[PDB]
Amino acid sequence: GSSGSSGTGEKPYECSICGKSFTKKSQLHVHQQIHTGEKPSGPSSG
Numbered sequence: 001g002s003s004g005s006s007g008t009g010e011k012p013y014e015c016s017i018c019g020k021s022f023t024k025k026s027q028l029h030v031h032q033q034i035h036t037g038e039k040p041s042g043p044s045s046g
């Protein structure tokens with residue numbers, strides 16, 4: 001978070017991966033795609 005305009009009511013749809021926000025659910029759905037690369041898992045499970 002940040003110290004400034006806290007406690008306002010950011011868009012109803014806010015990404016958790018990056019932290020972006022979207023006023024249209026759909027937008028978020030498609031956006032999430034952008035996060036189809038970086039993975040928390042290092043080694044490829046067998």
Ligand SMILES: [Zn+2]
Pocket residue numbers: 015016017018019020031032035
């Ligand atoms: Zn995101």
